[PDB]
Amino acid sequence: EWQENKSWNAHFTEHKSQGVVVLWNENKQQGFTNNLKRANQAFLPASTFKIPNSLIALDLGVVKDEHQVFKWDGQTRDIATWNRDHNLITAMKYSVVPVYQEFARQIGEARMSKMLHAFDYGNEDISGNVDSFWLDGGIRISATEQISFLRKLYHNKLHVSERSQRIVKQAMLTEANGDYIIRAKTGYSTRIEPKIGWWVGWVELDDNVWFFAMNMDMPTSDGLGLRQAITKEVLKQEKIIP
Ligand SMILES: COc1ccc(-c2cccc(C(=O)O)c2)cc1
């Protein structure tokens, strides 16, 4: 049911890094990873938390739809794409933390906690600031737990409306061509050690879906592109994508 393929470790060592890739073959109900223990190691989700955060905001009506404009608050931040108006699609695309912090404040601690328990999300612990716990609070989630959560989202089995789940899956759209569709979300955790990068989502094929969750050590922002590049090298090696 789970199989460990250490040959994938080469994809991390080539960049003098360390990490895990977890793949789940939905048709076969079989999982594959280079490191079974790290596959189950729990980290801060960082911006991968925008997936459940989006679902909750939509289902509570904090966000009406994917077109509602959230105006820039006028504070110039170090990420240029953050200093502009956004909707849910672009807020996800550019991982706009301040927009989602406003979501979290409107959701509030009580409803946020209830919804994460309902989602069985990670350790379900939101200790810390209601608008930063996923960056520097007590919430933790592993790669296999990310896949478990994503499988529910894909099948519309989370305890929010179908509409909310469809909109979030629209917002997760990352790449699409004649060969595959990727719906995914990046994360970059820097506020508490160890600094890591995330990429979680799935690859839609004609007759199967491959769910994936990867994280890797990320001492500097220079390596952020490796989150997707390493995942794609594994998918290519396993003949999942050309
Ligand atoms: C060194 O600090 C930072 C802080 C934030 C980012 C960032 C901001 C928005 C999107 C992404 C990204 O995943 O593409 C990364 C980078 C570096």
Ligand SMILES: [Cl-]
């Ligand atoms: Cl879509």
